[PDB]
Amino acid sequence: MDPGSRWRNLPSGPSLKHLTDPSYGIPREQQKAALQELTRAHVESFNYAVHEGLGLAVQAIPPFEFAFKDERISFTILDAVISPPTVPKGTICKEANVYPAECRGRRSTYRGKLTADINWAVNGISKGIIKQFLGYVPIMVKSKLCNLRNLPPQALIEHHEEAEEMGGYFIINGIEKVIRMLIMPRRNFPIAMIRPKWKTRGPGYTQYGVSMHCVREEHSAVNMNLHYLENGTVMLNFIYRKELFFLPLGFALKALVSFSDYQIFQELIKGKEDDSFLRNSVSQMLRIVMEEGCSTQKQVLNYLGECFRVKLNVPDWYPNEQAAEFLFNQCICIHLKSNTEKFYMLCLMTRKLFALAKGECMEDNPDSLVNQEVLTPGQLFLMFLKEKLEGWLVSIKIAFDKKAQKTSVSMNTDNLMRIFTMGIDLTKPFEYLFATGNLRSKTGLGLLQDSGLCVVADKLNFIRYLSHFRCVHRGADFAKMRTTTVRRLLPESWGFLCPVHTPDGEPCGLMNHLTAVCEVVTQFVYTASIPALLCNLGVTPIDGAPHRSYSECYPVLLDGVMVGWVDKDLAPGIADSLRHFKVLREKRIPPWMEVVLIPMTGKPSLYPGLFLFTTPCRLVRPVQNLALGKEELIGTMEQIFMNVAIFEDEVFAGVTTHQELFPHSLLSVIANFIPFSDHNQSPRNMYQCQMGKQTMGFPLLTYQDRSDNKLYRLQTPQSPLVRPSMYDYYDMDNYPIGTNAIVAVISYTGYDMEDAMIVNKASWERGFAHGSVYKSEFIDLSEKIKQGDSSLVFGIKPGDPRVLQKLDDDGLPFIGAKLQYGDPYYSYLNLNTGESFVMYYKSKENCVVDNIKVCSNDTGSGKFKCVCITMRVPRNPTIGDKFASRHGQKGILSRLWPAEDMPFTESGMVPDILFNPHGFPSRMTIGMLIESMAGKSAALHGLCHDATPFIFSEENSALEYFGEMLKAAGYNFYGTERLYSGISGLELEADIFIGVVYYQRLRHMVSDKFQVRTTGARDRVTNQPIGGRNVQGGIRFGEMERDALLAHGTSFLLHDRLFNCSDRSVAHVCVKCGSLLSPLLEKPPRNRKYNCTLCSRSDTIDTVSVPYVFRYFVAELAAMNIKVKLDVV
Amino acid sequence: TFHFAGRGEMNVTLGIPRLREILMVASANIKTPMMSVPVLNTKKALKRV
Amino acid sequence: MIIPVRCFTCGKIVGNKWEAYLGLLQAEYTEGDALDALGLKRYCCRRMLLAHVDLIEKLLNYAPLEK
DNA sequence: CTGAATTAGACAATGCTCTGTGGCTCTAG
DNA sequence: CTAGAGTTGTCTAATTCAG
């Protein structure tokens, strides 16, 4: 193919020789690079954000100045470093470094140490530099700051980590939490869109407007909108601290440059010279500023600083000119750093707005992936870190404000900088984001989302665990909205997002996953040479004359910087030269550059221009450039103007420019694990991607080192005999999730209709699909048992008859031990008192203790009070457990059928799973039939067959191939055998299709789902039963059940279910005045009579029978002075 | 379902939106108003329609 | 994890054939011929040993005592 | 010198049941 | 040391136009 290509080691077929290799189980000298690239976006974004983006971010924070009694005091941050996780100081250890296994088993946070070199100055002269500790920031595992960096797999085995361990996660309180990739708008690109809700925003606003998402070096993000008004005037929306401000365009364009008004005029009419409506409109916009006495740039800056100083909150000694410069730096086109470049980009956004509003270009779809990119974890980390550094400086100013209000004895600051200790500590506000996902900002960080930013990366199996690092989420705001247009599969996500791998239900179409070849640009390069390179080509500079009409030219954009203009007879030549330079790596053009040339059709197509993108966070995928014969990374917008080919046969000269690496590159990592997926119906492939991730498999290799809440383990998993080649590329036999089963497709028992399935009893009694679940309960005597005195330690009072031969002498169960219900679970004694308490085991499932680990605090000074018991619950397959094939065929076990009653073949073989053939016609999973024929051939010949999709055509069919294999093995061509009846003895007249299908055991068991409530706890407000099966509560008889039982005509059955079995209370009313609130019992002298408080007569009080919620109702209406009068007759 | 059904025919509102228009809203302005009158078999009527 | 004692489908003892299978495959037999030389005739028996992934050698690299 | 229709804003609704875990519920002044 | 990117679809308050 191509050397140095990342996809050249993809195997031609699945082998099975690694399972029996003599070097199996010996850890390799180097980690498998196929697996390390699945989390490479996470790691490389965090590596940028912590080393280089942190230096750029602290250079971006302006020097913070404020007012003392007499003199201005300036604070600037010269440097900020994040240190790798070490032990606290004053800790006696042999190893200073902390590793993630400790923070994962002790349930701590794997924290770095942020410290900054803050400089301070009084009266403009720098008096001294302060190195100062700010807080502890979390560390992504296997970053440049993790202590597992650069270690071989033997050294990762030594430190209790996985061999072949990738890390894109944070340990936050012992929990692996991943920042999933959110979909953002395309950065630094004018997205012209139509939104009718913008018409409800001003007096004459139209539905047309150009959005813009400006990010500055991945540490700032500012959304801004131009709007179109019906008189041709443009308003400029900009948001500052989550609130919107509307400025006419002439003020911004006149404040950014010192140009004349005629020169600003010529930049806005530049394409459309003769459209006299635009000419009158932009002369009117320039006239608006002239009418308000702003004839120079300085007067516009003065006016804009006057009008925005209250909301903006500079010190009161800045001029108004500087206060407007502050808003143009914090709010307007922040990716640019020069004001003339802001002028030219803002003129381009206005010209695109004029072309949209005059019906001449088309709406950029915000839902198409062309106009979108990804939010990486390093970007969110670095934005939140820059905001917390700025807030830390403001907290120091508030500290001087408090010491000017309270301790104003006029002590000079002569290294009086232990007031930095009185500043805020940003450990807890930084960990709140990574611990909850909720974003508490004052800026909002340019996001449109406040929550769900961090998600638990749980490790149910490895197929689920890979899906957190490939997931691209659309937004949490979209699941609530009931529209079906953001949930569409659009064709512009060919090869970038997977078509099958998406959930079902509420997140269907929103929670998308990357394809296996797709990858996020995370490298950052210097693009200082690229505009001079473009001007060496035909791109005229933006000041110089373009030597042709601008109506016969293209606007050039290099990363949101408008470079210039190209003669349209030269622009395909420049685009091909840039693709040539990119794929041959010639003139320091990055290999991840998107060279988009949107052509001038003369029709209402997309807005034309030569757009060049080199920024990070874009999705990019490898194809092969057929003209050069080398592999090219093409982007999402770049793809829609290319004709890639899928197969060798589809390549035509002069038509197809590119070609995919392999035809199944449109699918996920996970969706490439479905055998023969082009023979299944597509919802049945979408169901398998979901239930392949719910499988009780083999999660991990470090069971004693892992302290997490539940952990589902399959006992003897098997490699699939029929699997795609991606199963062996990603080495998925390290963590296999299923067993091969001899599946016979027969209607034999009466228990397999309607999705149910039959398992051989004798296979289940041998080791078929047996399992375990490891529950880890972290017991802390400080946190839960808060009685006081802080001196609780695990232990027993010696001679206690509650713990004899049932807990050990440390008050903590034995490690071989079993735990039934009500057994002593742990014992703890109070040391300042002497009294020992015992805690009992309240779960209803018999477990076996696995290990007990005992934890200190971070110093090694903690006392014997934190412990983490891990228990094994058996969970072998029972009636009611759910299995699945690899094709979307889920099914509850209905019956464990004996082996003597099972239909035996002529080979002497029973099946171990019976499948009902009526799961095929409506679902059309033909790939399950091919998998059974292929698995039977693979077992018989001793092979391993390739089940990669799109390798079988109609000429060379799959059924012809595997039938010739079965014919060569002396079996039937069509997969059927002569079975006999195990109940009758007679040979069945039909010819029964049997094979080998690889089944999966899902984690949904009936032992976690049944519940029964006779009587029990009641809600303390309404006296109705409570909800939940862990609290042993009741189930609802809701409104639609009430309706359907009214339709039966059974009224005493509703009276039963909804009055006698929820809340039958007996209230006392005064029959005269009709009031529950009025009766009252006499204070005793017995007698026990009631008095109506209203009419003062004891005769009229009698009982009625009301719900208790009716009494709560009449009391809460009495709280609003509403009288409820009863007619009690 | 969005049946286009050519230009010469008509389309109405289908399904649950039309069922909601009939029942829950009782609107004076439905999305697809329509009348439907048969014509007479008179030759003078067919030359007039 | 570890080689099953019996085949799942029929009760044939297959647990005593794992080291023989590895010694046959290191002696340059085909996997079909190595399953024939062990007397695994039904393909139920034959997938038990053909598809066995032996996670206990990977799971004993984390052996605790290292002494 | 005042009833008139109109239009923008406010507001209320948007399937059902069930199972889990994890963080926080008064931290900032 | 105590403290606070929806979508219909009806109802009402503002908002202009000759008698």
Place this chain on the structure above:
RNA sequence: UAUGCGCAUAACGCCACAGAG
């Protein structure tokens, strides 16, 4: 109200994620 033996202990919401049909 539940558990344990009249006695002792435990007596919950709100968000956000994930899932089942």
